[PDB]
CSV table of all heavy atoms in Angstrom, one decimal:
chain,number,residue,atom,x,y,z
A,1,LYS,N,0.4,3.3,-6.9
A,1,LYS,CA,-0.9,4.0,-6.9
A,1,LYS,C,-1.4,4.0,-5.5
A,1,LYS,O,-2.0,3.0,-5.0
A,1,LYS,CB,-1.8,3.3,-7.9
A,1,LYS,CG,-3.3,3.8,-7.9
A,1,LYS,CD,-4.1,3.1,-8.9
A,1,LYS,CE,-5.5,3.6,-8.9
A,1,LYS,NZ,-6.4,2.8,-9.7
A,2,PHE,N,-1.3,5.1,-4.8
A,2,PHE,CA,-1.7,5.3,-3.4
A,2,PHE,C,-3.0,6.1,-3.4
A,2,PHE,O,-3.0,7.3,-3.2
A,2,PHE,CB,-0.6,5.9,-2.6
A,2,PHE,CG,-0.8,5.9,-1.1
A,2,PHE,CD1,-0.9,4.7,-0.5
A,2,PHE,CD2,-0.8,7.1,-0.4
A,2,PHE,CE1,-1.0,4.6,0.9
A,2,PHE,CE2,-1.0,7.0,1.0
A,2,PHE,CZ,-1.1,5.8,1.6
A,3,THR,N,-4.1,5.3,-3.5
A,3,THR,CA,-5.4,5.9,-3.6
A,3,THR,C,-6.2,5.6,-2.3
A,3,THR,O,-5.9,4.8,-1.5
A,3,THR,CB,-6.2,5.5,-4.8
A,3,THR,OG1,-7.3,6.3,-5.1
A,3,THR,CG2,-6.7,4.0,-4.6
A,4,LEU,N,-7.3,6.4,-2.2
A,4,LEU,CA,-8.2,6.3,-1.0
A,4,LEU,C,-9.5,5.7,-1.4
A,4,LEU,O,-10.2,6.3,-2.2
A,4,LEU,CB,-8.4,7.7,-0.4
A,4,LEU,CG,-8.8,7.9,1.1
A,4,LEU,CD1,-8.5,9.3,1.5
A,4,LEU,CD2,-10.3,7.7,1.3
A,5,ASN,N,-9.8,4.6,-0.8
A,5,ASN,CA,-11.1,4.0,-1.1
A,5,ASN,C,-12.2,4.7,-0.3
A,5,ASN,O,-12.0,5.1,0.9
A,5,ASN,CB,-11.1,2.5,-0.7
A,5,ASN,CG,-10.5,1.6,-1.7
A,5,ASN,OD1,-10.5,0.4,-1.6
A,5,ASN,ND2,-10.0,2.2,-2.8
A,6,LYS,N,-13.3,5.0,-1.0
A,6,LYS,CA,-14.4,5.7,-0.4
A,6,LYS,C,-15.4,4.8,0.3
A,6,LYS,O,-15.9,5.2,1.4
A,6,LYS,CB,-15.2,6.6,-1.4
A,6,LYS,CG,-16.4,7.3,-0.9
A,6,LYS,CD,-17.1,8.0,-2.0
A,6,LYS,CE,-17.5,7.0,-3.1
A,6,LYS,NZ,-18.1,5.8,-2.5
A,7,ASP,N,-15.7,3.7,-0.3
A,7,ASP,CA,-16.7,2.7,0.3
A,7,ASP,C,-16.2,2.3,1.7
A,7,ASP,O,-17.0,2.1,2.7
A,7,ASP,CB,-16.9,1.5,-0.6
A,7,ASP,CG,-15.5,0.9,-1.0
A,7,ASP,OD1,-14.5,1.4,-0.6
A,7,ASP,OD2,-15.6,-0.2,-1.7
A,8,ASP,N,-14.9,2.1,1.9
A,8,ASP,CA,-14.2,1.9,3.1
A,8,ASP,C,-13.5,3.1,3.5
A,8,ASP,O,-13.6,4.2,2.8
A,8,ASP,CB,-13.4,0.6,3.1
A,8,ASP,CG,-12.9,0.1,4.4
A,8,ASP,OD1,-11.9,0.7,5.0
A,8,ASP,OD2,-13.5,-0.8,5.0
A,9,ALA,N,-12.7,3.0,4.6
A,9,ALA,CA,-11.8,4.1,5.0
A,9,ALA,C,-10.3,3.7,4.9
A,9,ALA,O,-9.5,4.2,5.7
A,9,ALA,CB,-12.1,4.6,6.4
A,10,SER,N,-10.0,2.9,3.9
A,10,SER,CA,-8.7,2.3,3.8
A,10,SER,C,-8.0,2.7,2.5
A,10,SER,O,-8.6,2.5,1.4
A,10,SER,CB,-8.8,0.8,3.9
A,10,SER,OG,-9.5,0.2,2.8
A,11,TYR,N,-6.8,3.2,2.5
A,11,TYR,CA,-6.0,3.4,1.3
A,11,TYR,C,-5.7,2.0,0.7
A,11,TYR,O,-5.6,1.0,1.4
A,11,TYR,CB,-4.7,4.1,1.7
A,11,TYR,CG,-4.9,5.6,1.8
A,11,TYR,CD1,-5.5,6.2,2.9
A,11,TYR,CD2,-4.4,6.4,0.7
A,11,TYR,CE1,-5.6,7.6,2.9
A,11,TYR,CE2,-4.6,7.8,0.8
A,11,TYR,CZ,-5.2,8.4,1.9
A,11,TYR,OH,-5.3,9.7,2.0
A,12,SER,N,-5.4,2.0,-0.6
A,12,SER,CA,-5.1,0.8,-1.3
A,12,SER,C,-3.8,1.1,-2.1
A,12,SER,O,-3.8,1.7,-3.2
A,12,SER,CB,-6.2,0.4,-2.3
A,12,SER,OG,-7.2,-0.3,-1.5
A,13,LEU,N,-2.7,0.6,-1.6
A,13,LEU,CA,-1.4,0.8,-2.2
A,13,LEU,C,-1.1,-0.3,-3.2
A,13,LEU,O,-1.3,-1.5,-2.9
A,13,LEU,CB,-0.3,0.9,-1.2
A,13,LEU,CG,1.1,1.1,-1.7
A,13,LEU,CD1,1.8,2.1,-0.8
A,13,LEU,CD2,1.9,-0.2,-1.7
A,14,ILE,N,-0.8,0.1,-4.4
A,14,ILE,CA,-0.7,-0.9,-5.5
A,14,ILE,C,0.7,-0.7,-6.1
A,14,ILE,O,0.9,0.3,-6.9
A,14,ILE,CB,-1.8,-0.7,-6.6
A,14,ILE,CG1,-3.1,-0.9,-6.0
A,14,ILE,CG2,-1.5,-1.7,-7.7
A,14,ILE,CD1,-4.3,-0.9,-7.0
A,15,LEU,N,1.6,-1.6,-5.9
A,15,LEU,CA,3.0,-1.5,-6.5
A,15,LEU,C,3.0,-2.4,-7.7
A,15,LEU,O,2.3,-3.4,-7.8
A,15,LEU,CB,4.0,-2.0,-5.5
A,15,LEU,CG,4.2,-1.1,-4.3
A,15,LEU,CD1,4.9,-1.9,-3.2
A,15,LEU,CD2,4.9,0.1,-4.6
A,16,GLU,N,3.8,-2.0,-8.7
A,16,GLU,CA,4.0,-2.8,-9.9
A,16,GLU,C,5.4,-2.7,-10.4
A,16,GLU,O,6.0,-1.6,-10.4
A,16,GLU,CB,3.1,-2.3,-11.0
A,16,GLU,CG,1.6,-2.7,-10.9
A,16,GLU,CD,1.0,-3.0,-12.2
A,16,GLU,OE1,1.7,-3.3,-13.1
A,16,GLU,OE2,-0.3,-3.0,-12.2
A,17,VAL,N,6.0,-3.8,-10.8
A,17,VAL,CA,7.3,-3.8,-11.4
A,17,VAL,C,7.3,-4.7,-12.7
A,17,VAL,O,6.6,-5.7,-12.7
A,17,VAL,CB,8.4,-4.4,-10.5
A,17,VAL,CG1,9.8,-4.2,-11.0
A,17,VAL,CG2,8.3,-3.7,-9.1
A,18,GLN,N,8.0,-4.2,-13.7
A,18,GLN,CA,8.1,-5.0,-15.0
A,18,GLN,C,8.6,-6.4,-14.7
A,18,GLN,O,8.2,-7.4,-15.3
A,18,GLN,CB,8.9,-4.3,-16.0
A,18,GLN,CG,10.3,-4.0,-15.6
A,18,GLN,CD,11.1,-3.2,-16.6
A,18,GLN,OE1,10.6,-3.0,-17.7
A,18,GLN,NE2,12.3,-2.8,-16.3
A,19,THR,N,9.6,-6.5,-13.8
A,19,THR,CA,10.2,-7.8,-13.5
A,19,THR,C,9.4,-8.5,-12.4
A,19,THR,O,8.2,-8.1,-12.2
A,19,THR,CB,11.6,-7.5,-12.9
A,19,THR,OG1,11.6,-6.5,-11.9
A,19,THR,CG2,12.5,-6.9,-14.1
A,20,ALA,N,9.9,-9.5,-11.8
A,20,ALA,CA,9.2,-10.2,-10.7
A,20,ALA,C,9.8,-9.7,-9.4
A,20,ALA,O,11.0,-9.6,-9.2
A,20,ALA,CB,9.4,-11.7,-10.8
A,21,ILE,N,8.9,-9.5,-8.4
A,21,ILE,CA,9.3,-8.9,-7.1
A,21,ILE,C,9.9,-10.0,-6.2
A,21,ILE,O,9.3,-11.1,-6.1
A,21,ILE,CB,8.1,-8.3,-6.4
A,21,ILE,CG1,7.3,-7.4,-7.5
A,21,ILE,CG2,8.6,-7.4,-5.3
A,21,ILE,CD1,6.1,-6.7,-6.8
A,22,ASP,N,11.0,-9.8,-5.6
A,22,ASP,CA,11.6,-10.7,-4.7
A,22,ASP,C,11.0,-10.5,-3.3
A,22,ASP,O,10.8,-11.5,-2.5
A,22,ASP,CB,13.1,-10.6,-4.7
A,22,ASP,CG,13.8,-11.4,-3.5
A,22,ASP,OD1,13.8,-10.9,-2.4
A,22,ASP,OD2,14.2,-12.5,-3.8
A,23,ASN,N,10.8,-9.2,-2.9
A,23,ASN,CA,10.2,-8.9,-1.6
A,23,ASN,C,9.9,-7.4,-1.6
A,23,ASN,O,10.6,-6.6,-2.3
A,23,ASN,CB,11.0,-9.3,-0.4
A,23,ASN,CG,12.3,-8.6,-0.3
A,23,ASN,OD1,12.3,-7.4,0.2
A,23,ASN,ND2,13.4,-9.2,-0.7
A,24,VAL,N,9.0,-7.0,-0.8
A,24,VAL,CA,8.6,-5.6,-0.6
A,24,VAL,C,8.5,-5.3,0.9
A,24,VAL,O,7.8,-6.0,1.6
A,24,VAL,CB,7.2,-5.2,-1.2
A,24,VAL,CG1,6.8,-3.8,-0.8
A,24,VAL,CG2,7.3,-5.3,-2.7
A,25,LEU,N,9.3,-4.3,1.4
A,25,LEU,CA,9.3,-3.9,2.7
A,25,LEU,C,8.3,-2.7,2.9
A,25,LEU,O,8.2,-1.9,2.0
A,25,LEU,CB,10.7,-3.4,3.2
A,25,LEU,CG,11.0,-3.4,4.7
A,25,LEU,CD1,12.5,-3.6,4.8
A,25,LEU,CD2,10.6,-2.2,5.4
A,26,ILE,N,7.6,-2.6,4.0
A,26,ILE,CA,6.7,-1.6,4.3
A,26,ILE,C,7.1,-1.0,5.7
A,26,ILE,O,6.8,-1.7,6.7
A,26,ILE,CB,5.2,-2.0,4.3
A,26,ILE,CG1,4.8,-2.4,2.9
A,26,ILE,CG2,4.3,-0.9,4.8
A,26,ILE,CD1,4.6,-1.2,2.0
A,27,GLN,N,7.7,0.2,5.7
A,27,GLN,CA,8.1,0.8,7.0
A,27,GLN,C,7.2,2.1,7.1
A,27,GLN,O,7.0,2.8,6.1
A,27,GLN,CB,9.5,1.2,7.0
A,27,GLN,CG,10.0,1.9,8.2
A,27,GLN,CD,10.0,3.4,8.0
A,27,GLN,OE1,10.6,3.9,7.0
A,27,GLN,NE2,9.4,4.2,8.8
A,28,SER,N,6.8,2.4,8.3
A,28,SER,CA,5.9,3.5,8.6
A,28,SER,C,6.4,4.3,9.8
A,28,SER,O,7.3,3.9,10.5
A,28,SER,CB,4.5,3.0,8.8
A,28,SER,OG,3.8,4.0,9.5
A,29,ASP,N,5.8,5.5,10.0
A,29,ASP,CA,5.9,6.3,11.2
A,29,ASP,C,4.6,6.6,11.8
A,29,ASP,O,4.5,7.5,12.6
A,29,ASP,CB,6.6,7.6,10.9
A,29,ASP,CG,8.0,7.4,10.3
A,29,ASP,OD1,8.6,6.4,10.6
A,29,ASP,OD2,8.5,8.3,9.6
A,30,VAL,N,3.5,5.9,11.4
A,30,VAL,CA,2.2,6.1,11.8
A,30,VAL,C,1.5,4.9,12.3
A,30,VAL,O,1.7,3.8,11.7
A,30,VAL,CB,1.3,6.7,10.7
A,30,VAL,CG1,-0.1,7.1,11.1
A,30,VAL,CG2,2.1,7.9,10.1
A,31,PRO,N,0.7,4.9,13.4
A,31,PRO,CA,-0.2,3.7,13.7
A,31,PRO,C,-1.0,3.4,12.5
A,31,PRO,O,-1.9,4.2,12.0
A,31,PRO,CB,-1.0,4.2,14.8
A,31,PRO,CG,-0.1,5.2,15.5
A,31,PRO,CD,0.7,5.9,14.4
A,32,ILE,N,-0.8,2.2,11.9
A,32,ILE,CA,-1.3,1.9,10.6
A,32,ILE,C,-1.8,0.4,10.6
A,32,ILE,O,-1.1,-0.4,11.2
A,32,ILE,CB,-0.3,2.1,9.5
A,32,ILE,CG1,-0.3,3.6,9.1
A,32,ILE,CG2,-0.6,1.3,8.2
A,32,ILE,CD1,0.7,4.0,8.1
A,33,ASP,N,-2.9,0.1,10.0
A,33,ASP,CA,-3.4,-1.3,10.0
A,33,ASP,C,-3.3,-1.8,8.6
A,33,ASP,O,-4.1,-1.6,7.7
A,33,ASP,CB,-4.9,-1.3,10.4
A,33,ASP,CG,-5.1,-0.9,11.9
A,33,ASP,OD1,-5.0,0.3,12.2
A,33,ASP,OD2,-5.3,-1.8,12.7
A,34,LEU,N,-2.2,-2.6,8.4
A,34,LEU,CA,-2.0,-3.3,7.1
A,34,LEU,C,-3.0,-4.5,7.1
A,34,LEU,O,-2.6,-5.6,7.7
A,34,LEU,CB,-0.6,-3.8,6.9
A,34,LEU,CG,0.4,-2.8,6.2
A,34,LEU,CD1,0.7,-1.7,7.1
A,34,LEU,CD2,1.6,-3.6,5.8
A,35,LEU,N,-4.2,-4.4,6.6
A,35,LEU,CA,-5.1,-5.4,6.5
A,35,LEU,C,-4.8,-6.3,5.3
A,35,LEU,O,-4.6,-5.8,4.2
A,35,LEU,CB,-6.5,-4.9,6.3
A,35,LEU,CG,-6.9,-3.7,7.2
A,35,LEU,CD1,-8.3,-3.3,7.0
A,35,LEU,CD2,-6.6,-4.0,8.7
């Protein structure tokens, strides 16, 4: 769920898996601030 928060200017990416996650990689091509 890659939605855009209006109160702030920050997208909120929400991943979900039925199982348990071992790790998640985040690779980009844009100057991006993972807060």
Side-chain angles (χ1 to χ4, degrees):
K1 174 177 180 191
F2 191 59
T3 195
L4 201 161
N5 279 186
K6 178 188 54 47
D7 51 357
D8 193 277
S10 66
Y11 278 76
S12 279
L13 181 138
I14 301 188
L15 297 162
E16 285 217 19
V17 189
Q18 59 181 355
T19 51
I21 317 180
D22 171 276
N23 67 79
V24 171
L25 203 155
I26 292 288
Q27 176 267 308
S28 157
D29 299 335
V30 183
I32 280 172
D33 293 78
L34 272 71
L35 320 182

